[PDB]
Design a protein around this nucleic acid. Structure first.
Lengths: 48, 51, 102, 78, 177, 116, 135
RNA sequence: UGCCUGGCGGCCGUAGCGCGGUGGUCCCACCUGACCCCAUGCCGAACUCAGAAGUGAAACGCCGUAGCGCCGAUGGUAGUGUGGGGUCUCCCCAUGCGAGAGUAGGGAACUGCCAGGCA
RNA sequence: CCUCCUAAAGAGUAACGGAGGAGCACGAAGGUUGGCUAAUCCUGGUCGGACAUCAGGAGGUUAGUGCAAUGGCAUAAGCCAGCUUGACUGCGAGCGUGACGGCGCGAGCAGGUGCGAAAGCAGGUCAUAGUGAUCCGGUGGUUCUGAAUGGAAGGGCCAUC
RNA sequence: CCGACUUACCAACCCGAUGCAAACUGCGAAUACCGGAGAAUGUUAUCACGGGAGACACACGGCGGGUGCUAACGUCCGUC
RNA sequence: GCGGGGUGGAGCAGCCGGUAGCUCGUCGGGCAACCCGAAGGUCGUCGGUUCAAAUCCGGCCCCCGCAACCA
C-alpha cells in the first residue's frame, strides 16, 4: 500500500441509540453516533 | 510550413552549430540539448540561436 | 485587404435608421452631415473620423475605429459607435433643450 | 469533358532481388518490400524500410517457420 | 477482520454442508469490492471530479483511481482521452472492513428501504448493487456535501453461478428483497 | 494466466538472444524452488543445471525459496559451469523482473567468476 | 427493376464472359429455365420475363430469380469522341451456359412449361426447361 | 530400465476448441503474512519478499469421447504452354501440366536435452 | 510527388482509363528499459437513456497506426511510465534503382554519448509522399590562396540561408 | 410487468441453401522469370572498352486487356 | 457541356467536423424614432465517411454566370 498518499485510517468506536458497541475502522476521526444500528433495523430483526 | 528553421550553437565556444526546425507558437521555450561537436570532440550542451 | 464601407451601410449597421433606404433618403435630404457638412451617401466612413450624424432631433458625433459591415444587436451597436464624451454632452444638451421645448 | 483521375506514382521496383539458392556477397539486398512480408532470420538484417539484407556470404534460403507460418529468409553459410 | 474470521470459522462450514463441496476452497470466496461512478457531467467543470475523488477517499479509505474515456461518444459530447469518473478497488483487510461498514451501518440508512433485489447478480456469481445517496455512509456529512451523488458497489466472488452467490451473501446475512 | 503472460514477456529477449547465438543461462523461479540451466546456442542441449530441488544443495539450505537459497544455487551453477568450461553466458530474465531472488542468483553467478 | 442498392465502385471494366456457369442444378424449386449460350441480361430483360411469368401463372407458384444484374454498363452520349469513361446507363448480369435463370414451384409442369416458354421469348439467349433432380 | 512432474526446444491446427473423468509422496498451482528489498497513475490483482496450515476447488497436466475446427485421397471438372482447326465476343482437337470446391476417409499428436519423486 | 487496379502470379508497362492523397507533423509522436493488450456483443449495476464509466462472460485484432491507400505489426511497429538526445562526427564491405543528374538499403571500424545488472539497441519516426538542380549572392569557422613584399579585399574548403 | 396477441407489418445479428468482383482472397495452377549442375549443338551466339551511325511518325494478324457499342482498316498497352 | 448557390416568412455572416445565430417581418413589454423578451430553420432531397455532418464525399432536382466557335 502506498505511503502517505491515502487518507488517514484508524480504529474508531461506533455507537447507536439501540446501544450496541462494535469496533470499526474509518477515516472520519471523531466518534460516530447512529440513528439505526444493524441489530435494531426492523427488517433485520424480522419484526417488521 | 509553420515550423521555422533554427541553429543550435555549440556552447564550447568553437562556433560549430547544428540546424533543426521547430514551431514558435506551441513551444516558445528555448531548445537545449547535448549533441556531439567534432572540433572539440566532446558532448557539449547546445543552445538554439537565430538562423 | 481592407473592405470598404459605405456611409449608409455604416448607419444601417449602427441601427440609427430602420433601413438602408431610409438612411440614403436622410443623407440625400441633407439632414445627415459628415464632418459637420452635407455629404453624399457614397462617402466612406473612416476610423477616428467624426460623423456629425443628425437623427430625429438629436445630433451625434462619433469617431469610432471599429467599423462593421454587418448589422449587430444594439448591445454591440453601443460598441460599434464610440459616442465620445463631448458628443455625449452635446446630446444631453439637445435633450434638455427638447425637454424645455416640450 | 474533364476527368479527376489520371494520377499515379512511379513504380518502386520492389520484389525479391535474390531468389532461393543464389550465392550472395555480404550486405546484398535480398528482398525489397513494404512491410515485413518476409521476416529476418539467421544472418539476415532488416533495414528500416523493411528490406532484408544478407549479413554474411552464403546461399539465401526461404523457409516457413513458427506458429504464424510466416516466411523467413536465412543465409546458409558457405 | 471480523468478517474474515466469520468466514474462516462458520460461514465456510455452513456453505460446505449446504452444497456438499469436497474441497474446502471450493466454497465461493469474495475476491474484491469495486466502487465506481459515472461523473459524465464533469465535461462542464473539471473540479467537480476532485470533490468526487475526495468524497470516496473518505468513504473507501484509499485514493480513487480516476477513470478514462475508453473511446469517443459524440451523443454524450465526450471524446477519447477525458476523465469521466472515479473508481476504488478494495481487497483484504479493507475489503472486509468496508463490507462490515456496509452491512452494519449503510444498508439500514437508505430512506424508504424495502430491501435489495436478488436479481442483481450478474450470472457468474458476482453481485452488483447501486447506492443512490452517499450520506448513508458515516464518513460523508450532510452539511458540507456539494451535491446529491451516488455510486455502485460490485462484489466479485469466485462463485460459479447465481445460487452459490446468493448462498454466500445469505451466509454473510446480507439483506435480500 | 501468469504462465502465458510470463512467456509472452520473455519471448522477445528469448528470440533476440537466439538470433545472437550466445549460450543462454535460463533461470526458473517458483514459490518453493529455483532452477538454473545453461543451454547451448541451438536451444536443445542443456550443458549444466542446478536447482534447489536437488538433494545436494537442498540439505544445506534452511528454506529453498529464499534469496539465500537463490545465491547458493547460483554459486552451484557457476561452479559446475566453470568445471565444464563455459566461463561466459547471457542471462535470461525469462519474464522474471530482475530483482529479488533472480537478482541474487545473477550476483552469485557473477561473484563465482562467471562473466556476464 | 433490379439494381444493386450500393456498390464500392461506380464504374467497372468491360471484362469477358468465358467459362461455364455455376449453380447449374435447380435448387430452390421444382422447375427452372436454363441458359444455353453466352449473354448479358439487362435489368429490363429480367423485369420483363418476371412479369411475363408471374402473369402467366396468375399469382399461384412461388418465383425465384437466380441471376442479379450487378455489372454497371456505361454508354457515351451521342456526339462525343473520347475524354473519359461514359456515364452508367443500365446494369447487366453476365450469363454463361448452364446458369439457371428463373425457378418456379407450386405449379403443374405443363403450365410451368407454358410460362417459361412465354418468358424465354423476352430474353436474348437460348433457353431450355429443366426439372428438379434428386441428385 | 518403466511411470509421473518442471524447464528448454524441435514442429506449427492429424498437433486447436468443446464434453466427461482423474492427480497431490515429489513437482506445479492455489494459499498464509507483508513493518521491511519491491509495486500499485487505488488495490500484496500484477510484480516482489518472508513461509509451508489446508487443498487439487480454479488453473495445469494426463486419459477417453467426433459436437466443431483441421488434414484429405482416386476419378472427373476448370484452367493453360506448344501445334492445328471451327459456325471465331467463344470453342474444339493432339500432346504436356493439371487445379479449386466436393466425396470416401484420417484425426483427440509425435519427438530431442537436462533435472526431480516413485518402483 | 505518394497508394491501389488496368499490369497478363519476377521487374517494368500507355490512354483527356478507374479511385483517393501530398507541398506536412513531432524535442516528443525520437532512443532505450520495464510493463500492458483491442473492436463488437451479452448479463448485472444510481442519476445513465441504444452508445459514458464499474464487474464478469463470449470473441480473438473484426481494433489501433498523427494524416490517403497498400503491404505490415502480438517478440508487437499498438497503449502507459522512468531515464534520456544515437533527430551524434568521420568513414563504409556490398547491393538495389535510374540514360544521366541523382535517389535508396547497409553489416562493420574509430571518437564520444544515452538506456539496460547484463546480452544488446540507438546514425530519426511501421515503410512507402511532405520536394527544387545550376548560377548569383548572404552569415559563421578555417591563412588554403593572397598579382612586388607584409597585411587586407576577393577567391577557395566546411557548415548554412 | 411478465406471459405474447393478429398485422399495413418492418424486421438487426446468427443459421441452412445459390450467385457475383479489376481496386474481395481462409485456396491456386499452366507459362514466364532468377540461380545451380549436367550432355549435345551453335562461325563467341555473351560481357566490357573504343571509332561510325541510323532511329525515337510505325501498320496488320494471333493471344491477354482498358477505352469504344466485346463497332470501326478506331485508339492506348504487354508478348509473338 | 463547365463552374457557383440552394440556410426561421425575406435578407444574411457564419458553418466549412464539435450541440444553429444576427437584422427586418409577427406578437408582447419598455418607450414616431429607439430598447428588451419570445415563437420562428431543421440547413434543396437521397446515400456514404466519421465518435459526431449546417460542415465532408457520390448521385439526383431547380436557379444563376459562361462557352456550344473557324471552316
Amino acid at each position: 500500500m502506498k505511503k502517505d498518499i491515502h487518507p488517514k485510517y484508524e480504529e474508531i468506536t461506533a455507537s447507536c441509540s439501540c446501544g450496541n458497541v462494535m469496533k470499526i475502522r474509518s477515516t472520519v476521526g471523531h466518534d460516530l453516533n447512529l440513528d439505526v444500528c444493524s441489530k435494531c433495523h426492523p427488517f433485520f430483526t424480522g419484526k417488521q | 510550413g509553420i515550423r521555422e528553421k533554427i541553429k543550435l550553437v555549440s556552447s564550447a565556444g568553437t562556433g560549430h552549430f547544428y540546424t533543426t526546425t521547430k514551431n514558435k507558437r506551441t513551444k516558445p521555450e528555448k531548445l537545449e540539448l547535448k549533441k556531439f561537436d567534432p572540433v572539440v570532440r566532446q558532448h557539449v550542451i547546445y543552445k538554439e540561436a537565430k538562423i | 485587404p481592407a473592405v470598404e464601407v459605405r456611409l449608409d451601410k455604416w448607419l444601417w449597421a449602427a441601427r440609427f435608421y430602420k433601413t438602408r433606404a431610409l438612411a440614403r433618403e436622410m443623407i440625400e435630404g441633407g439632414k445627415v452631415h459628415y464632418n459637420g457638412q452635407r455629404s453624399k451617401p457614397s462617402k466612406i466612413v473612416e476610423l477616428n473620423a467624426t460623423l456629425t450624424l443628425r437623427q430625429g432631433n438629436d445630433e451625434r458625433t462619433v469617431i469610432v475605429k471599429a467599423i462593421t459591415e454587418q448589422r449587430r444587436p444594439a448591445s454591440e451597436a453601443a460598441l460599434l459607435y464610440e459616442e465620445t464624451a463631448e458628443s455625449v454632452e452635446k446630446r444631453e444638451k439637445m435633450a434638455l433643450a427638447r425637454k424645455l421645448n416640450a | 469533358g474533364s476527368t479527376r483521375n489520371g494520377r499515379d506514382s512511379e513504380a518502386k521496383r520492389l520484389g525479391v532481388k535474390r531468389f532461393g539458392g543464389e550465392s550472395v556477397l555480404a550486405g546484398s539486398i535480398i528482398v525489397r518490400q513494404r512491410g515485413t512480408k518476409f521476416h529476418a532470420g539467421a544472418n539476415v538484417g532488416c533495414g528500416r524500410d523493411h528490406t532484408l539484407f544478407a549479413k554474411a556470404d552464403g546461399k539465401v534460403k526461404f523457409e516457413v517457420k513458427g506458429p504464424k507460418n510466416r516466411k523467413f529468409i536465412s543465409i546458409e553459410a558457405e | 477482520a471480523k468478517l474474515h474470521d466469520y468466514y474462516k470459522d462458520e460461514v465456510v462450514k455452513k456453505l460446505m454442508t449446504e452444497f456438499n463441496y469436497n474441497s474446502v476452497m471450493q466454497v465461493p470466496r469474495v475476491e474484491k469490492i469495486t466502487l465506481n461512478m459515472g461523473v459524465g457531467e464533469a465535461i462542464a467543470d473539471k473540479k467537480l471530479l476532485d470533490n468526487a475523488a475526495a468524497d470516496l477517499a473518505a468513504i473507501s479509505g484509499q485514493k480513487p483511481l480516476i477513470t478514462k474515456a475508453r473511446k469517443s461518444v459524440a451523443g454524450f459530447k465526450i471524446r477519447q482521452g477525458y476523465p469521466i469518473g472515479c473508481k476504488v478497488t478494495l481487497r483484504g483487510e479493507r475489503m472486509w472492513e468496508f463490507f462490515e461498514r456496509l452491512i452494519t451501518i449503510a444498508v439500514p440508512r437508505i430512506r424508504d428501504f424495502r430491501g435489495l433485489s436478488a436479481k442483481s447478480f450478474d450470472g457468474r456469481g458476482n453481485y452488483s448493487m447501486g447506492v443512490r445517496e452517499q450520506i448513508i455512509f458515516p464518513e460523508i456529512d450532510y452539511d458540507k456535501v456539494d451535491r446529491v451523488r451516488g455510486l455502485d458497489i460490485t462484489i466479485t466472488t469466485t462463485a460459479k453461478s447465481d445460487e452459490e452467490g446468493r448462498a454466500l451473501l445469505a451466509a454473510f446475512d446480507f439483506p435480500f428483497r | 494466466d501468469k504462465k502465458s503472460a510470463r512467456i509472452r514477456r520473455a519471448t522477445r529477449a528469448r528470440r533476440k538472444l537466439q538470433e545472437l547465438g550466445a549460450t543462454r543461462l535460463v533461470v526458473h523461479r517458483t514459490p518453493r524452488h529455483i532452477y538454473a540451466q545453461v543451454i547451448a546456442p541451438n536451444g536443445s542441449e542443456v550443458l549444466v543445471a542446478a536447482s534447489t530441488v536437488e538433494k545436494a544443495i537442498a540439505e544445506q539450505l534452511k528454506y529453498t525459496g529464499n534469496k539465500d537459497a537463490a545465491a547458493a544455487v547460483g554459486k552451484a551453477v557457476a561452479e559446475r559451469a566453470l568445471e565444464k568450461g563455459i566461463k561466459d553466458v547471457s542471462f535470461d530474465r525469462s519474464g522474471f523482473q530482475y530483482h529479488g531472488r533472480v537478482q541474487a542468483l545473477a550476483d552469485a553467478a557473477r561473484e563465482a567468476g562467471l562473466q556476464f | 427493376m433490379l439494381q444493386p442498392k450500393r456498390t464500392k465502385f461506380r464504374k467497372m471494366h468491360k471484362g469477358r464472359n468465358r467459362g461455364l456457369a455455376q449453380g447449374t442444378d435447380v435448387s430452390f424449386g421444382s422447375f427452372g429455365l436454363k441458359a444455353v449460350g453466352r449473354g448479358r441480361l439487362t435489368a429490363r430483360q429480367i423485369e420483363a420475363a418476371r412479369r411475363a411469368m408471374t402473369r402467366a401463372v396468375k399469382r399461384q407458384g412461388k418465383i425465384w430469380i437466380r441471376v442479379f444484374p450487378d455489372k454497371p454498363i456505361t454508354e457515351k452520349p451521342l456526339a462525343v469522341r473520347g475524354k473519359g469513361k461514359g456515364n452508367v446507363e443500365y446494369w447487366v448480369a453476365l450469363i454463361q451456359p448452364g446458369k439457371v435463370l428463373y425457378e418456379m414451384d407450386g405449379v403443374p409442369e405443363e403450365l410451368a412449361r407454358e410460362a417459361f416458354k412465354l418468358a424465354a421469348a423476352k430474353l436474348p439467349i437460348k433457353t431450355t426447361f429443366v426439372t428438379k433432380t434428386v441428385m
